[PDB]
Amino acid sequence: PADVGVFGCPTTVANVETVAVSPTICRRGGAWFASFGRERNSGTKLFNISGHVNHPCTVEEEMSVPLKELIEKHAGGVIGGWDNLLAVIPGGSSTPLIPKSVCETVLMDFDALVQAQTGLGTAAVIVMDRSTDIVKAIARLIEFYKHESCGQCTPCREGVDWMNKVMARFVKGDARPAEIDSLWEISKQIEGHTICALGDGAAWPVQGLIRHFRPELEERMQQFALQHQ
């Protein structure tokens, strides 16, 4: 876009928050903004906290704030106590989820969350306690991605519809364990081959759910095989 953008003219696309904070950085200096956070993760960030929390809310906070501190301080904590936490998606639907153990001592910046194989994304924390069907939530996210794809390139279009069907079958446990790895491969055949990042943002949630809750999927399909003989 810096060469051929809108109307064929040079263009630069910037988020609302970035341009909104730009004049304050100019007025108060760049060093003051760089003071907050770690190196290469400077500044303050707006965090939306939603899901299974007592008080879901939007709060502006220093960048490298721990996830547990952010939940307990502003959001009022996980409903039913911290031990009731099951999983958390820290950067909206695109970023993969992390379990309780990983999120016990994790920070919110790009580098630390990339180290946790997730990424900060847009800093949209969605929490889920132990009393929810995480497979159902991830299937709903994949269905959302299926509904919201332009469909011009075959990988995203066909593969995301395929993953939606596979995840809908997983929710009931109608598949076989050998399919799970297959799904992983399907995701790897989508990520990196599409035009935009919607394909990557649809492949990542499936990869994270598989990587962190393969036993849950296997248990559910074993139960389905047992009831249906």
Ligand X SMILES: Cc1cc2nc3c(=O)[nH]c(=O)nc-3n(C[C@H](O)[C@H](O)[C@H](O)COP(=O)(O)O)c2cc1C
Which residue ranges are tagged as binding site?
Answer: 13, 15, 18, 122, 149-153, 156-157, 194, 196, 199
Whole-angstrom distance between the N-terminal and C-terminal Cα of the chain? 57
Instruction: Give 20 or 57: the residue with its C-beta nearer to ligand X.
Output: 20
CB of 127 to ligand X, least distance (A): 21
Q: Which helix (H) or strand (E) holds 129?
A: strand 124-129
Specify the stretch interacting with ligand X by CB under 6 A; choose among 11-19, 32-40, 52-60, 171-179. 11-19
Can you tell me the distance from the alpha carbon of 47 to that of 216, in angstroms, rounded to the nearest whole number? Answer: 30
31 binds, among ligand X, ligand SF4, other proteins, none (CB under 5 to 8 A by kind): none
Question: For ligand X, which residue of 28, 195, 196, 216 counts as binding (CB under 6 A)?
Answer: 196
Is 149 one of the binding residues for ligand SF4 (CB under 6 A)? Answer: yes
The DSSP letter of residue 3 is S
CB of 150 to ligand SF4, least distance (A): 4
User: Residues within the annotated binding site for [4Fe-4S] cluster?
Assistant: 149-153, 156-157, 194, 196, 199
Helix (H, G, I), strand (E, B) or coil at 44: strand
Say if CB 109 and CB 41 are below 8 A apart.
yes
Say if CB 147 and CB 140 are below 8 A apart.
no
User: How would you class 185 by CB atoms within 10 Å of its CB: exposed for 0-12, middle for 13-18, buried for 19 or more?
Assistant: exposed
Question: For ligand X, which residue of 53, 78, 89, 198 counts as binding (CB under 6 A)?
Answer: 198
Q: At what angle do helices 177-190 and 160-172 cross, to 10 degrees?
A: 160
Phi, psi of 127 (to 5 degrees): -105, 150
Size of the site for ligand SF4 (CB under 6 A): 12
Question: For other proteins, which residue of 72, 143, 179, 200 counts as binding (CB under 8 A)?
Answer: 179
Q: Which of residues 15-44 bind ligand X (CB under 6 A)?
A: 15, 18
**Which chain residues interact with ligand SF4 by CB under 6 A?**
149-153, 156-157, 194-196, 198-199
